[PDB]
């Protein structure tokens, strides 16, 4: 996990124009309608990944799905857009980067979410025929697509992630740093289900750690902690390397950090530390001749003792203070149309609210002065003329919407 935190910008295809043509004929002054509709434009998703590590490879270019084709003559409707899938890990929250609403958590393989609907194509001037419309001059221009930044954030198996072999004696160092009894918490987004335990320390807060227990070959076989363990280790907030100080400490500590390096350069950076266990036997001197030589490894390492309680005091608190110093998970913020409101702005004269209708006419293509009636049809329809009459609004006043006007006329 290179980059567990990202902010992408998405948009999606903005659908085609209908189209207002006619039939021509060399001896036909004026054929139908022969406007097509345009295509609907393609939507953006998000789709989880067992093989995406991190966020990492995403991208800094705006993702943008296709757009549809415009409708053409001869009744031909133009082609949709192409959806466009953007990969993710698994174990990945959605959120707006802008309203911070969980859109989704991606934990299963091939799991899917919709991120941007594209929009509709427009529909061409064939489709406004009607008794009085025997030829119309207008149409439906394509709606834009819908386009948002997404914040996306890699899911945590715990604040600290336990490093070591078998021999470092990591379950029971976990054991005795915790009051309440450790709990294997099988994550949706996991293949390993890892121990989890609760830390609690002074600031009256608390963090948690995880150990991924294995029956496996040493340090000296040379096969390492394994791929599958690293990328699990990797959803955490600060390391911990564990180390058993009676056997070759500072070589198990290098072919540790090597291994993680290997695995991602960034791993090694993370705030870590270093536990050394199994101290009971030796002597205060030895210890520190251990420390020192191991701190010179480039981490802070701290002695402790599970059955003397040695030490733990020491450590709580050091990770207490690594993990506060990591930017922590975000909270998903508070959940938070064909509505129809009549505003007066002045004497006779009335704003029309409705999302909805504004941007329809918004895309009304060709002759405006011939759609007259039709966006009278819409504007009954869509409860407008009912908000007007229920409005007190008089006959002769001004209607002002979606950025055109229009002189109020009541219903005989």
């Given at each position: 996990m290179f980059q567990d935190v990202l902010v992408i910008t998405v948009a999606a295809g903005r659908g085609g124009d209908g189209a207002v043509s006619f039939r021509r004929e060399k001896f036909v002054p004026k054929g139908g309608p022969d406007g097509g509709d345009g295509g609907r434009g393609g939507s953006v998703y998000l789709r989880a990944r067992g093989?995406?590590?991190?966020?990492?490879?995403?991208?800094?270019?705006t993702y943008k799905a296709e757009d549809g084709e415009h409708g053409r003559g001869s009744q031909q409707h133009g082609r949709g857009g192409e959806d466009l899938v953007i990969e993710v890990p698994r174990g990945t929250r959605v959120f707006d980067?802008?309203?911070?609403?969980?859109?989704?958590?991606?934990?299963?393989?091939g799991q899917t979410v919709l991120v941007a609907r594209g929009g509709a194509g427009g529909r061409g001037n064939?489709?406004?025929?009607s008794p009085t419309r025997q030829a119309p001059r207008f149409a439906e221009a394509g709606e834009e697509g819908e386009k948002r930044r997404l914040r996306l954030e890699l899911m945590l198996i715990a604040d600290v992630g336990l490093v070591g072999?078998?021999?470092?004696g990591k379950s029971s160092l976990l054991a005795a740093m915790t009051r309440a009894h450790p709990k294997i918490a099988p994550y949706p987004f996991t293949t390993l289900s890892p121990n989890l335990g609760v830390v609690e320390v002074s600031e009256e807060e608390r963090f948690t750690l995880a150990d991924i227990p294995g029956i496996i070959e040493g340090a000296?076989?040379?096969?390492?902690?394994g791929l599958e363990f690293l990328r699990h280790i990797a959803r955490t907030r600060v390391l911990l390397y564990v180390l058993d100080?009676?056997?070759?400490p500072l070589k198990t500590l290098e072919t540790l950090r090597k291994e993680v390096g290997a695995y991602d350069p960034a791993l090694l950076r993370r705030p870590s530390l270093v536990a050394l266990n199994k101290?009971?036997?030796?002597?205060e001197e030895a210890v520190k001749a251990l420390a020192d030589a191991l701190a010179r490894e480039g981490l802070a390492v701290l002695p402790v003792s599970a059955?003397?309680?040695?030490?733990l005091p020491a450590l709580k608190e050091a990770l207490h203070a690594l993990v506060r110093s990591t930017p922590p998970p975000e909270m998903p913020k508070p959940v938070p149309q064909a509505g129809v409101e009549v505003v007066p702005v002045a004497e006779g004269v009335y704003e029309v609210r409705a999302p909805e209708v504004e941007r329809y006419l918004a895309?009304?293509?060709?002759?405006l002065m011939e759609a007259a009636g039709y966006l009278q049809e819409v504007f009954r329809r869509q409860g407008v003329e009912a908000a007007l009459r229920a409005k007190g609004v008089r006959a002769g006043d001004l209607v002002r919407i979606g950025g055109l006007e229009f002189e109020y006329i009541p219903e005989v």
């Open positions: 093989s995406v590590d991190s966020l990492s490879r995403l991208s800094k270019r980067a802008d309203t911070g609403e969980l859109l989704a958590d991606l934990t299963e393989e064939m489709h406004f025929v072999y078998p021999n470092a000296s076989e040379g096969k390492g902690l100080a009676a056997d070759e101290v009971d036997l030796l002597e059955l003397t309680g040695a030490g895309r009304i293509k060709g002759d």
